[PDB]
Symmetry: C3
Subunit: 195 residues, 3 copies
């Protein structure tokens, strides 16, 4: 997870075709972002993981819905797994394969269930609709051993507020990847400044 | 089985207190192209209302279902589908055994996944307005595109425009529709359909 | 079991850092008609504070309980009731074995239903303010009328008027009450009672 902690940002890419994936990889690396989450919303996601396999990025597969799908993502090139909510059988697969699994959670009951599965780096999703900054501030006090990766509706306007949180692994989202490579550079730098 | 809900786009929620004109309401709803009505089991007047409405022509839902035994009581009183505030696995078992739709309430992605694991893909989102329904459901449209949601809880006319843009709605539910007399109900239903277009 | 909480209407939450005048605080709370106090277990100081307050006349709660073993340590230090951030079924087992109240935190209707299935009907609602506490609890008053809630998390004076009107509150909990010296504590408690009335 050191790469994520170092990077502080986890860009989220839904692949629709035409993306300059290797150009993206180079830019992200140049800007000190060493990880990328590829969503599995389409079959294009797996192909993109394969295309990026050798790019130098720590690749995450997102929207994982099952252990079979998790395994397919790992075989395509993913180095870590992310799901919208907690899936105990995906936790089993990840532990079997020796890879990190960041399940989405929201509530304290869910945080406890993830911990009981040995998981202490957790996605908080969807962050903005569920008042992420204020929730995560609460969680910093009662779950101080947990690090969170809020994702969902995050935009520049919200970043200053997340910056003050002691319990963040990274901030995730698609906002970083809107526009051309020039725009990605600017958004990545702006985000690091705001954080 | 929920083609009626989907064409209706609206699911009025009635908590029965005594003195309601149930058959007049059913007539009005049908006239206005709303073919379903959820009757809450917040008290025992709810079961009597289902019975009274058995053969009105509406698809009747029973809400606030809290147990399999209460669900079975609702089916025997004339409910065609079951709704609970949160996810009740044993109610899902009863509904599946009886071949009726069950729309459990969920809020979080983990709860959506658990419902899917029980073979349920038409889910209530409850309570919708306090938990930022439009923005949450917008997020779920992307990550759970196989799921259709029925948000309910604090919905009012002011909120309907924002729900209109959602690709993943089965219907919008709530009691706001049924405030006032029958003329008011006609207006509120027509306004809601307009705001949801 | 929780008549004290109910009569108090307030549950002050103390995270102990060293230096606090615990026995003075206990005296003030009692004088002001607040008969309970929750001590968080965010560090080892918490257990020490429970021991220090053991015979102060307060109904002592242990907060931030994370396991059955920690729960048991809290009871042995003098806690009379147990509170956790979320629902821990094995803590419920320990509490029922020891004959003490356990107030688990819940947020969603599914979580309420799971706590009810464990025989638990006085529940914490946490974290209350970030999750739209007043409006969520208003919905729960209708669909879960047998449940009493203890909202905690980010509550401040400004929010109290809106909680006052809820029919399903066991008490309102939080640390805002304990910011300042003992005269400030007196003023905040009196203010909170007036705003909840």
């Amino acid at each position: 997870l050191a790469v994520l902690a170092e990077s502080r940002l986890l860009p989220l890419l839904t692949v629709r075709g035409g993306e300059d994936l290797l150009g993206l990889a180079r830019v992200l690396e140049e800007e000190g972002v060493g990880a990328l989450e590829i969503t599995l919303r389409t079959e294009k996601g797996l192909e993109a993981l394969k295309a990026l396999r050798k790019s130098g990025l720590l690749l995450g597969a997102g929207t994982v819905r099952s252990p079979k799908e998790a395994e397919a993502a790992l075989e395509a090139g993913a180095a870590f797994l992310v799901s919208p909510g907690l899936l105990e059988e995906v936790a089993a697969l990840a532990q079997a394969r020796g890879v990190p699994y960041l399940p989405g959670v929201l509530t304290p009951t869910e945080v406890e269930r993830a911990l009981a599965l040995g998981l202490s780096a957790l996605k908080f999703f969807p962050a903005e609709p569920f008042q992420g900054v204020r929730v995560l501030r609460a969680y910093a006090e009662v779950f101080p051993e947990v690090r969170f990766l809020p994702t969902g509706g995050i935009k520049e306007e919200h970043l200053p507020h997340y910056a003050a949180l002691p319990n963040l692994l990274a901030v995730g989202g698609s906002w970083l990847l809107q526009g051309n490579l020039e725009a990605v550079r600017a958004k990545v730098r702006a985000a690091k400044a705001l954080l």
